[PDB]
DNA sequence: CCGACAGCGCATCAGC
DNA sequence: GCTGATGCGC
DNA sequence: GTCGG
């Protein structure tokens, strides 16, 4: 964290932009910039220094510039004193309101959590439970936690199938000392894009860590994603462990190279990468990479046996899950 | 300049 | 109900 | 807001 104060900043303002200005591109290209000065292995000294580096242009380096003297910026002073996006920003803070809610919320007066609690029945469910779960939410989730999570969702997805392959992704396969959340990618041999010879596939692992009460709430729930909210076994007198949120991911076995890349990430890394795929003639997602042709639409999926191959197609060295880190 | 900016699952809604 | 757009989240 | 062509 050598450039902290100036990646906060633009986090910040990259926060702002997304939840009040509702200017995603705004907020993407913040993000990319505090991303690429994360990583930066110098300490910043010049806005123009900064400039060097690509996704900063003259905008946010003339900010920096101005960081860099004062030690803030006018503008977040401005936006931090401004009742309207302080209230905006907040609201967006629980899972499931986003920036047209926060909105929506703030022009009927309901702009506090006590508000919210107040007014509990004008909420969607998903909203209703990331309420719920405010506090616990905003907790991390040290790495010794995930292992004994992990430890829990393996050995219950094997009691209901020995076939299914359950893999943590997310911050934890990239090695972090603690995540936000859990995710699961799931496969079975019945699950492939021939067939789905089986139906509830992921609906009885839910059921069973339902069965023995690691996942607590459903955020949503569909026949290949689910997302939800889980909780560690506590001890005898002891204080309960925060409730998690837990996305589970039902991929085609045989395209579970691509879903392990985008599963494991991070968000950046895969938009880094799937941006590079479009240069260089392909496109990726979670299922496929898939070649680019003359008029843009995407062929036929290309064969990949490793995460590696993903890589190679683009021509990039192959980068272990701990440098995906962006 | 200025067009493009990653790609998609699920929930909710409008309109039919 | 279905379909298409939008919101939200990954 | 940044950028490649
Ligand atoms: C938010 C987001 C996530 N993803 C992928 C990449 C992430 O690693 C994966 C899990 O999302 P996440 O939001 O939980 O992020 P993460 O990498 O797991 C964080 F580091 P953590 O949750 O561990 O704090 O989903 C994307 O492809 N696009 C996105 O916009
Ligand atoms: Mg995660
Ligand atoms: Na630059
Ligand atoms: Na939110
Ligand atoms: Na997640």
Not at 25 to 31: D, S
Not at 47 to 54: D, F, M, T
Not at 128 to 152: A, C, H, T
């Amino acid at each position: 964290t050598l450039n902290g104060g100036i990646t906060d900043m633009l986090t910040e303002l990259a926060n702002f932009e997304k939840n009040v200005s509702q200017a995603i591109h705004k907020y993407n290209a913040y993000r990319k910039a505090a991303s690429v000065i994360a990583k930066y292995p110098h300490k910043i000294k010049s806005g123009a220094e900064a400039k060097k580096l690509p996704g900063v242009g003259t905008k946010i380096l003339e900010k920096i510039d101005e960081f860099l003297a004062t030690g803030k910026l006018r503008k977040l002073e401005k936006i931090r004193q401004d009742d309207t996006s302080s209230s905006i920003n907040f609201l967006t803070r629980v899972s499931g309101i986003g920036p047209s809610a926060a909105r929506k919320f703030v022009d009927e007066g309901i702009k506090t959590l006590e508000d919210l609690r107040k007014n509990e029945d004008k909420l969607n469910h998903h909203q209703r439970i990331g309420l719920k779960y405010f506090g616990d939410f905003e907790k991390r989730i040290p790495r010794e936690e995930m292992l004994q999570m992990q430890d829990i969702v393996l050995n219950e997805v094997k009691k209901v199938d020995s076939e299914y392959i359950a893999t943590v992704c997310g911050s934890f396969r990239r090695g972090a000392e603690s995540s936000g959340d859990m995710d699961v990618l799931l496969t079975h041999p019945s699950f492939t894009s021939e067939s789905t010879k089986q139906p509830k596939l992921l609906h009885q692992v839910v059921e069973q860590l339902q069965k023995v009460h690691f996942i607590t709430d459903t955020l949503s729930k569909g026949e290949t994603k689910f997302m939800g909210v889980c909780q560690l076994p506590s001890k005898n007198d002891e204080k309960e462990y925060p409730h998690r949120r837990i996305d589970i991911r039902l991929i085609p076995k045989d395209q579970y190279y691509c879903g392990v890349l985008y599963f494991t990430g991070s968000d950046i890394f895969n938009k880094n990468m799937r941006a590079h795929a479009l240069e260089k003639g392909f496109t990726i997602n979670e299922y496929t990479i898939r070649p680019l042709g003359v008029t843009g639409v995407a062929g036929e999926p290309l064969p990949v046996d490793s995460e590696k191959d993903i890589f190679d197609y683009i021509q990039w060295k192959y980068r272990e899950p701990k440098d995906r880190s962006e």
